[PDB]
C-alpha cells in the first residue's frame, strides 16, 4: 500500500492521473521524483522548469555542480539527485528531444532507468517540448517499465485521450 491517490490502473504496474506532477509531488512526498531532463540538465522549461522552481532553484544549482564534476548525460541516460522539498531523490531521466533530431529507440532505453527504482511518480518521456507522440511514449512506458510507476499528465485534454485510446 501506498499514498499515491486517485491514479487509474492501466496495467498491473502502470498507473496515470491528471495532475501537475509539482503538486502532485509536493503531497506525497515519493522516494523518487522523475524529471524530464537534457543532457545538461539545464531545467529552463517544460517538467524540468516546473520541478527546478518549485525548489527555488536548489535543483539547478545542484545540477550544475553534478555536470561540472561529471560532464553531460547520455541521451537515454540518467543521475540520481536530490529530491529536494519535492522527494526523497529525484531521477533525472534524458528522453530523445525530437526537437533535436534524436533517435526515437532512444525512448526504451530512457524508460529502463525506471526499473532501478521499486516506485516512482514520473511524467511521460520525451513528451510535451520534447516533440514526441505522448501516445507511444505510454506505450513504451507500459512495455519496458517493470517496477511500479505513477504517471501524471498536466494536460487534462492529453490525460483522457491517452485514457481513450490505450490498449
Ligand atoms: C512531460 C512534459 C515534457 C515537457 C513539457 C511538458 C511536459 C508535460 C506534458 C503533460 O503532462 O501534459 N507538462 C508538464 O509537466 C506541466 N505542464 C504545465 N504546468 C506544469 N506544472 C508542473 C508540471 C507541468
Request: hydrophobic residues 40%; charged residues 20%; proline residues 3%.
Amino acid at each position: 500500500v501506498n499514498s499515491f491517490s486517485g491514479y487509474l490502473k492501466l496495467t498491473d504496474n502502470v498507473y496515470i492521473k491528471n495532475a501537475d506532477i509539482v503538486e502532485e509531488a509536493k503531497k506525497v512526498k515519493p522516494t523518487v521524483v522523475v524529471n524530464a531532463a537534457n543532457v545538461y540538465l539545464k531545467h529552463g522549461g517544460g517538467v524540468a522548469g516546473a520541478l527546478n522552481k518549485a525548489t527555488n532553484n536548489a535543483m539547478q544549482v545542484e545540477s550544475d555542480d553534478y555536470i561540472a564534476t561529471n560532464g553531460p548525460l547520455k541521451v537515454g541516460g540518467s543521475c540520481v539527485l536530490s529530491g529536494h522539498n519535492l522527494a526523497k531523490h529525484c531521477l533525472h531521466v534524458v528522453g530523445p528531444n525530437v526537437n533535436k533530431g534524436e533517435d526515437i529507440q532512444l525512448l526504451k532505453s530512457a524508460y529502463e532507468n525506471f526499473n532501478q527504482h521499486e516506485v516512482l511518480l514520473a511524467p511521460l518521456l520525451s513528451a510535451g517540448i520534447f516533440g514526441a507522440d505522448p501516445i507511444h511514449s505510454l506505450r513504451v512506458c507500459v512495455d519496458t517499465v517493470r517496477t511500479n510507476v505513477y504517471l501524471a499528465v498536466f494536460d487534462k485534454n492529453l490525460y483522457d485521450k491517452l485514457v481513450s485510446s490505450f490498449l
